Structures are given as structure tokens and as C-alpha cells.
Amino acid sequence: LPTAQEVQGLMARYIELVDVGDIEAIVQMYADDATVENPFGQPPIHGREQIAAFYRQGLKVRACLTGPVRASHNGCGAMPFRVEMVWNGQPCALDVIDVMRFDEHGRIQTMQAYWSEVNLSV
Amino acid sequence: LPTAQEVQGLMARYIELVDVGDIEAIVQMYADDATVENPFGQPPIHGREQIAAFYRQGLKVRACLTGPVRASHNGCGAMPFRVEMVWNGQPCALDVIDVMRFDEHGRIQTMQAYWSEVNLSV
Numbered sequence A, B: 001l002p003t004a005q006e007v008q009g010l011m012a013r014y015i016e017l018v019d020v021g022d023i024e025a026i027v028q029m030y031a032d033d034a035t036v037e038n039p040f041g042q043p044p045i046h047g048r049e050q051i052a053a054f055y056r057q058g059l060k061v062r063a064c065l066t067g068p069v070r071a072s073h074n075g076c077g078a079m080p081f082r083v084e085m086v087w088n089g090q091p092c093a094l095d096v097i098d099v100m101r102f103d104e105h106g107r108i109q110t111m112q113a114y115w116s117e118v119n120l121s122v
């Protein structure tokens, strides 16, 4: 179960994997039965196959942290970042905060991505 | 129950109240039986009297948002901010993300403040 420093490293590497768009490496960060709520407020998606389908649909994309990872001492953390993408030939940016809980093996057990339309910029 | 735009306004006003240090106005934002986990990972504190005691102990302090509020459509949001304080005559800064759930009256029902020692700068 990752320490606070290890959560900082894992969550930063998640953003680097989203940024390059390595779907298979992203999926491997998740527990095999993880859930993703993205955006938070919508129903969870369950397990690596569903999660892979989500990232493949969603991911030229750039992602970068826009402030430090905030980690806890119970395997969780939160981070702010910006995703830039191209939508109907119109580039846009989305500001997001992800909250993650890691399991006892260092895998993401739950992902909650906070954002709404108010965080999109076209 | 606040809409996404209303969550953005409520969470920004919370930071303005922390920044000026108005304990009674901060406490009034919370539901009478709210909980606070600060830092997340520690046991919750319950109800306005406990919450007032927490802010009075904790709060010259400056607080400002360091990126936009990320709101949901189910009365929740998350925000990144920086708190500057004076510790043993040594000014320091703490980077934090608060995750809030508001109730059906617009009051904070749950507060979870993500940060650890790794987010403190002396």
C-alpha cells in the first residue's frame, strides 16, 4: 500500500501515461476489478475491460499536472491537472481533479474525476 | 442542492472566509451535523461545535485558490488551494485539495482535505 511519497509518484506517472496515450500502461495501473467515475456523479465503470474501453474512446491529447499531488497516509491522493484535446477540429482544454484510492498492491482501486462543463474551455 | 455553478460559488466563498479568518461565517457554511476529515486519513470530526474548535485552533493566515473549482452535477466539488501561515515564527505554505459534498440546503455535509507533510513548505 503506497506511502504518501509513493502515491505522489504513482499519480504523477498516471498523468504521464495519459499524456502519451498509452492505453495498455494506463489500464495496468488499475486493479483488475477497479472502478472509474468520470465525471464524478456519473455511474461507475467496473473492471479493466470497461476501463480500457473508456480510455480508448477518450484518448492528440496532452495532460499535465497544474499543481502538486496531495497524498494521504492511507493510500489515497488527489491532484489537479489540465487535459488538452481536439474536439470537432476545435482544440479545447478541460481542468480536472482526480481523487484515487490505491490498494494493498499499489494498483488504483477507485478513480473519481471531478469536473463539469464549467471546466471546459474551447 | 447546489448546481455545478453554485458549488463553484460556495467553494470559492469558503476559501475567501478561510482567508479572512472568519470562524463563525465558516462554521455557518457547514451542516449542523457535518463532518470534517483534515487531513484525509485522520478520524472525522462531527458537528458545528467540534468544527468551530478545529478552525479556531487552525486559524495571520492567507488562503487562495491555485486553480479552478471542479464541480459535479450531484452537489459535490473539489478545489486546489494554498494556505500560508506562520509556524514557530517560520512562515510556511501548505498545498491542499478539498473535496466537499453539499446537502439539499446548500450546507457542507462532508469536507475531506487532502494533504500530507509532503505538501508543506517552510
Ligand SMILES: Oc1ccccc1F
Binding pocket: A018, A038, A083, A096, A098, A113
Ligand atoms: O483521469 C482523467 C480524467 C479526465 C480526463 C482524462 C483523464 F485521464
Ligand SMILES: Oc1ccccc1F
Binding pocket: B018, B038, B083, B096, B098, B113
Ligand atoms: O479546508 C482547509 C484545509 C486545510 C487547511 C485549511 C483549510 F481551511
